[PDB]
């Protein structure tokens, strides 16, 4: 898609994933967080550790990633690599022996 390729190129030409995606620094990034539990893989009574398969639906608005759909043939949504953008650093506080944060950087629906 030439339209979608141009859109992706123009969105990220000077995008910064370091700063928060607010218009003004006094604003608060409001992130909707929904835990989906896909599978209770294991309960380890002896080690007192529970292994679960989950999805963390995180939703927030990035002020810089708006576009006008009529500029790009009516493209209203795109999928982009999540490593490109700023993300909330949600950490599992009570991690026992897994990863603290997300490690599977699947695509972002923008």
């Amino acid at each position, epitope marked *: 898609s*030439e*339209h979608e390729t*141009r*859109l992706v190129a*123009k*969105l990220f*030409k*000077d*995008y910064s994933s370091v700063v928060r995606p607010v218009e003004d620094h006094r604003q608060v990034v409001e992130v909707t967080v929904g835990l989906q539990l896909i599978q209770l893989i294991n309960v380890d009574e002896v080690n007192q550790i529970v292994t679960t398969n989950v999805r963390l639906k995180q939703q927030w608005v990035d002020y*810089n*990633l*708006k*576009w*006008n*759909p*009529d*500029d*790009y*043939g*009516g493209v209203k949504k795109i999928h982009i690599p999540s490593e490109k953008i700023w993300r909330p650093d949600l950490v599992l506080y009570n991690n026992a022996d897994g990863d603290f944060a997300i490690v599977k950087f699947t695509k972002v629906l923008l």
Partner: antibody
């Protein structure tokens, strides 16, 4: 500095084809997008399409079949061509340089506009 | 697309008056609204974008305000050169233009 000048026929017959040339000076087409606007008689303006700086094009979905846009970066000219003309197409046609912020675009400078009359 | 309406349709004001032109959308325009000035037989000139960013070289007497679906252009001191038609337009969802407010010196 920035100037745009539309040119073309003042009268065109219905079902004929219209061609307009937007001459450009003070900036390079390779770094600024050029949109085309028309103001139908007794109506507010409407956006027709854009020539991107990268040379791509996008058109108003109502006019996409009727429109084509091309450019010559050496002459600094943008060409609008339209077919299946009808009396409703009579109005002032503008070419505009478009400013940008990220993916958002808006019309920043207008040409003087060429009045096109569609009548037999 | 976001439908836009302007008021007044025709406004008469004396030189030096403060005047405000109102622009209202059918939907949240998200401050992606711009104002441009048009004169008979003259190329339209952008005055303001993003509802309050003054275009370079425009007299500072022009100022913009608004949020959500209501926006205003203010001319704090009407000069004789400012008699023209003013269109607001929106560029966050499609491209829609107001009907335009025609501004004439009071007689």
């Amino acid at each position: 500095e920035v100037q745009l000048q539309e040119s073309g026929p003042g009268l065109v017959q219905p079902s004929e084809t219209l061609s307009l040339t937007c001459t450009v000076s003070g900036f390079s087409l390779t770094s600024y997008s050029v949109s085309w606007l028309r103001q139908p008689s007794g109506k507010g303006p409407e956006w027709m399409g854009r020539m991107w700086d990268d040379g791509g094009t996008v058109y108003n979905s109502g006019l996409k079949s009727r429109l084509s846009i091309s450019r010559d970066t050496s002459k600094n000219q943008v060409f609008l061509k339209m077919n299946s003309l009808q009396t409703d197409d009579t109005g002032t046609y503008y070419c505009t340089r478009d400013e940008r912020i990220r993916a958002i675009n808006w019309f920043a400078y207008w040409g003087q506009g060429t009045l096109v009359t569609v009548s037999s | 697309d976001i439908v836009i309406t302007q008021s007044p349709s025709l406004l008469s004001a004396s030189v030096g008056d403060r005047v405000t032109l109102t622009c209202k959308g059918s939907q949240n325009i998200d401050n992606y609204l711009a104002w441009y000035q048009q004169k008979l037989g003259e190329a339209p000139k952008l005055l303001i974008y993003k509802t309050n960013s003054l275009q370079t070289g425009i007299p500072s007497r022009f100022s913009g305000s608004g949020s959500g679906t209501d926006y205003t252009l203010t001319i704090s001191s009407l000069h004789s050169e400012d008699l023209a038609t003013y269109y607001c337009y929106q560029y966050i969802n499609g491209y829609t233009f107001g009907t335009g407010t025609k501004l004439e010196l009071k007689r």
